[PDB]
Design a protein around this ligand. Sequence first.
Ligand SMILES: [Ca+2]
Length: 351
Amino acid sequence: HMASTYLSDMDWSSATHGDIDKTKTVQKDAPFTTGNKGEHTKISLLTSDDKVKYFDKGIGTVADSPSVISYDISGQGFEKFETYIGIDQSANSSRSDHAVVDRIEIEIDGKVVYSSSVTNPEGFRYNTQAQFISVTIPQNAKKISLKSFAGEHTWGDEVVFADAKLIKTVSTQTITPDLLNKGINGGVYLSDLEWVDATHGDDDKSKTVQKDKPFTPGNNGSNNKIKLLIDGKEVEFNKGLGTVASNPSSIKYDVSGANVTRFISYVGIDRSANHLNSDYADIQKFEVVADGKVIYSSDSKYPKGIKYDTSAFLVDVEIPKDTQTIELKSYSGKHTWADELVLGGALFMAN
Ligand SMILES: [Ca+2]
């Protein structure tokens, strides 16, 4: 799922043009000269087979040495820039020195990412067919610049960036406890699903893995919400799973009937657990297992396990295409009582 934002719908950080009248401004969704006059004329360019194509959206300027239109794209997450370039069909081309553009460039953070010099060394004339630009934007990008070079004169240099747009993949927001508590579109909470089976480390086998509750309080009849340490601060979760770690204990889901692509959960020991200060780990490790293959293990980040005081960690892992079975495996520290492992906000994504 892709979304595009038109440059003409954004605010430029700066804009310069080659027209001597500085009361005139670079035009949104119109050629420069006609747009400045108030005319309703749309941006148009000569395409293949000399067909004239009209555009609802774009940026209209007059080239200079150079004319520069810049946009701040910091933290915006854009992936591509796409536009058609050429001299607008509305240009004054009555003389051969009019409508002569030496070069058009696209620049990102000081780097030329497109230049018309490659395909058009002599530049653009009134009847030069449009060039389509498609450039990748670096994840770190801060500034994109639309540059046009007039050459000897600016006369008739009606440069248009037709259909000028920035494009990105529609993606989930940065994962936070708040986000998992509010909900994500397309996210299905594990506690809203039936497991195939769910084992636990508690000796009483009449007890069951708990949905949206820690194990012990849940099996005692309480509906207390799952609670974890997030960055040294206690946070309750609306949704999740409550279990007791074992050797291991495992919760198994049959995901064969769906195209599951992602598993998201905070993982740690519930605040309600029995805990005593100890050198030993309370929980040894947690694993996400896809069709018998470990696709996440907590012992990379925590090679000696976790304790009651350990801040809950974010598990965010891709599920391989065509996965039949997902298992969530909890390994007890075996020397203490704090084996009340909870999965805060545990959900699946289907992409
Ligand atoms: Ca020129």
